[PDB]
Design a protein around this ligand. Structure first.
Ligand SMILES: [Ca+2]
Length: 279
């Protein structure tokens, strides 16, 4: 399949080179996989989701995304126009309030919720979780992310936006998950992206067009935007049978575009997520 005039980040993850605008992907498009978006919620009624999105848990008085961030992330995972895995099922877990913040205890509870809830969902090709959140180092937050990954979910987490070593942030610093840095359309490390030996992969994170609340769209930037590109890529690859939840991060790193990013500090991977699709 070919989607012309796609958002630059979609075009980038199916290209060996920057500067193109068509997204190429196998038409299976993540069908039969599931992605949990653990964030501010998802505006499921948005047509871009085509009935494939649903809120499954909230820790607040409503399950509505009153912020937009979770809707944007979900859109990069799996919206029809802005998504990597255009046929995946999307499940929203609202651990962040409408101001975009959440207590670590609530975030931990939402991770444990996903580890159990996947047993209530039909995801024959596999389960992914996209965590575009984080704060300072917490061993409890890291151990919750580790449990989620151990349960058989491919966990993708944002590296953080501190232009610092991700070793000091959670869940970014949990070794066993897939920690995602951000790049821009000219293949630079995004100025704000964290770095360090705990990163597994980079994805597009600067000026990312996706869905927003009120049935709208907008471009925004962050490692929060890079993470759902990798989560959607994992779902896509698991539907194609190329990898499994336990192996997807390594598979993505093995098949990534290698050595092509600028402003990568010594000791940080220079790997950019790539779907290797050959039509
Ligand atoms: Ca890792």
């Amino acid at each position: 399949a070919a989607q012309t005039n796609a958002p630059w980040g979609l075009a980038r993850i199916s290209s060996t080179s920057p500067g193109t605008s068509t997204y190429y992907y196998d038409e299976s498009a993540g069908q039969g996989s599931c992605v949990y978006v653990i964030d501010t919620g998802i505006e499921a009624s948005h047509p871009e989701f085509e009935g494939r999105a649903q809120m499954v848990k909230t820790y607040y008085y409503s399950s509505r995304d009153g912020n937009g961030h979770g809707t944007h992330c979900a859109g990069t995972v799996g919206s029809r126009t802005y998504g990597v895995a255009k046929k995946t099922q999307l499940f929203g877990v609202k651990v962040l309030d409408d101001n975009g913040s959440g207590q670590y205890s609530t975030i931990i509870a939402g991770m444990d919720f996903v580890a159990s809830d996947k047993n209530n969902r039909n995801c024959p090709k596999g389960v992914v979780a996209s965590l575009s959140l984080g704060g300072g180092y917490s061993s409890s937050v890291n151990s919750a992310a580790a449990r989620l990954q151990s349960s058989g979910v491919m966990v993708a987490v944002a590296a953080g936006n501190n232009n610092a070593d991700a070793r000091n942030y959670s869940p970014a610093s949990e070794p066993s998950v897939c920690t995602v840095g951000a790049s821009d359309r000219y293949d630079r490390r995004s100025s704000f992206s964290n770095y360090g030996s705990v990163l597994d992969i980079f994805g597009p994170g600067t000026d990312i067009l996706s869905t927003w609340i009120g049935g709208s769209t907008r471009s925004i930037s962050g490692t929060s935007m890079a993470t759902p590109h990798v989560a959607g890529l994992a779902a896509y690859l698991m539907t194609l049978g190329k990898t499994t939840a336990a192996s997807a991060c390594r598979y993505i790193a093995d098949t990534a575009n290698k050595g092509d990013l600028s402003n990568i500090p010594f000791g940080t991977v220079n790997l950019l997520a790539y779907n290797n699709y050959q039509a």
